[PDB]
Amino acid sequence: IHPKNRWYKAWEMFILVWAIYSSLFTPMEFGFFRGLPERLFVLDIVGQIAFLVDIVLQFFVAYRDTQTYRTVYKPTRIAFRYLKSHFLMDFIGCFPWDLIYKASGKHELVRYLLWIRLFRVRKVVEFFQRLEKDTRINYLFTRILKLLFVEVYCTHTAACIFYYLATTLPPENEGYTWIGSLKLGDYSYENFREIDLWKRYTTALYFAIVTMATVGYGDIHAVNLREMIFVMIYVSFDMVLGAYLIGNITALIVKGSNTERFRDKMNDLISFMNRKKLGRDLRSQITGHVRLQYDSHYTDTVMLQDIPASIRAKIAQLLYLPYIKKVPLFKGCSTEFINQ
Amino acid sequence: PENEGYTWIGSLKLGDYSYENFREIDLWKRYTTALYFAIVTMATVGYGDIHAVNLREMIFVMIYVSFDMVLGAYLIGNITALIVK
Amino acid sequence: GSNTERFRDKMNDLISFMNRKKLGRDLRSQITGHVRLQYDSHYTDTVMLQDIPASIRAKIAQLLYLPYIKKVPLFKGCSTEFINQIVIRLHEEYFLPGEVITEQGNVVDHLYFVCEGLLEALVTKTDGSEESVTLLGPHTSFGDISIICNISQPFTVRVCELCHLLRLD
Ligand SMILES: [K+]
């Protein structure tokens, strides 16, 4: 098959949607749910079969060679390449990790294994790589968007883990956790395992989001000795993430803009013109002409001028000859004379 | 009006003043209290005396702080670029 | 940043310019190829190289370029010492298919040796100029008689294929 087939791309988009769903659901299944309920039977099953089908179909896809511009179509070699990099993790993540938990005596580590399914975020990573290659979207805005998605995914995962850390403590000694000690307004979280899923999730995500923005109100804070060590790591990592975001936005802005260039040009012009003490009507004429010059995209000529190396020939040939032969002084002249 | 507790205002006890009936206070006290909250949250200070307490306020605060984080990064970037030039 | 950013920035500006005026896909291509080349390390490579006194470079030249200059028939002087004198002062240069190298106007300045690739040799005439003078290939010379006897480089040459041409003062 060809890395750019009509529907293969349709399958890629389908699997991207499924990958987003699984990436955003696995931490929530692991944290807020000590064993998936009965109602959520078919959702897990369908997700697993979909990703297994993708595995099988990826086993039948030609790969583009890296050092060399040949896309190979050797089935044994596509086998080898797939079975090396991204087969073991995708296969292990495909096993039913809820039925195994509810069959193997309900042991905790088989549920801890659920985090293998986070490897599907590679799909979004490759999607952002493809978007970066495309010429429609600027490179640096793509980098900013990728960092904004990374921040939000890390925040959601951190919220799931932060609620999980409050379930390790025994239910009787629940007064010594970040949740179960809240008294927000009139509401008190007494038995925090008996509230709706969305209340607990929104509280945890509220804590994580006002922590990633470095607001930190302090209505919800860490209490245990395991919740302190988690917040230290989370804020230490968030600091560097935020510095990266600021740096990328700064680079995007510092690249430049047309109004900035025009204002610099007019700065030089006004300095030179006030220095030589020329007349005001000349000032108006010059500023009007330069304003038209920068409105007409005059600076494209020099940009093209910087080492195109004579492929200008057909550019000018297709761009200017429309107005050339028409003038009543070239009638009956030679073609190469017109081109030159 | 019955559940004026369990609200960001109505459960406030700044100093010796209690926002008991938060619909009869002068318009300017309510307005400048809300603005105070919004400005200490856009400056990323977050004192914590005025905080969201419901589930309709947690969502709004999350959206607002995400948007303001991006905006603050943008303002820092503009000032840095113009100083660098 | 890095060079992968300069490439993308220049190509983005070029795309803006080209699609703003609806140029056409064939030239789009010509341009793309050219842009790519300038960015690639081939160029800034030799330029930066510079500095390295020469003694050291000397060995770089005699390890890279020696067989290439030895395989040209014109240099059968049989003195490999003369040939090592030749290699010690060579500078590479890459031109894309469709590049003018030398024409009648420019006098001799360098010995343009031709590496793997085809460069078209032509001359001029008085009606459509002239076509098909000679198709230079590897292990040959190009622009030699001018330094041999007298200045001025006739036989206008516009390259037709990619080639890693050498150049000696
Ligand atoms: K703060």
Residue numbers in the entry:
A (entry chain A): 58 to 397
B (entry chain D): 228 to 312
C (entry chain B): 313 to 481
Please share excerpts from the published article on this structure.
GORK is a shaker-like potassium channel in plants that contains ankyrin (ANK) repeats. GORK, also known as guard cell outward rectifying K+ channel, is the only outward-rectifying potassium channel in guard cells. In contrast, GORK activation causes potassium efflux, reducing guard cell turgor and volume and in turn stomatal closure. Each protomer has an N-terminal transmembrane domain (TMD, residues 58–313, containing helices S1–S6), followed by three cytoplasmic domains: the C-linker (residues 314–365), cyclic nucleotide-binding domain homolog (CNBDH) (residues 366–510), and ANK (residues 511–724).
Tetrameric reconstructions of AtGORK were obtained in two conformational states at resolutions of 3.4 Å (AtGORKFL1) and 4.3 Å (AtGORKFL2), allowing de novo modeling of 662 of 820 amino acids (residues 58–720) for each protomer, while the remaining regions were not resolved due to their intrinsic flexibility. The full-length AtGORKFL forms a tetramer with elongated cytoplasmic regulatory domains, with its architecture showing a symmetry reduction from four-fold (C4) to two-fold (C2). Notably, the symmetry in the TMD portion adopts a typical four-fold (C4), but reduces to a two-fold (C2) in their following cytoplasmic domains, thus leading to a deformation within the tetrameric channel. Remarkably, ANK repeats from two neighboring protomers form a stable dimer through specific interactions mediated by their protruding loops, creating a buried area of ~1,500 Å2. As a result of ANK dimerization, positional deviations and conformational changes are induced in the adjacent CNBDH and C-linker, leading to a reduction in symmetry within the tetrameric channel. This reduction affects the communication and coupling between cytoplasmic domains and transmembrane helices, ultimately maintaining GORK in an autoinhibited, preactivation state. Due to the reduced symmetry within the tetramer, the C-linkers exhibits distinct conformations between adjacent protomers, either “flat” or “kinked”. Consequently, the C-linker in AtGORK deviates from C4 symmetry, and the presence of the “flat” conformation disrupts the formation of a C4 symmetrical gating ring, leading to decoupling between the transmembrane helices and the cytoplasmic domains, ultimately affecting channel gating. In contrast, the TMD of full-length AtGORKFL1 displays quasi-C4 symmetry (essentially C2 symmetry), with subtle yet distinct differences between protomers A/C and B/D at the N-terminal end of helix S5, yielding an RMSD of approximately 0.75 Å/256 superimposed Cα. Analysis using the HOLE suggests that the AtGORK adopts a closed conformation.
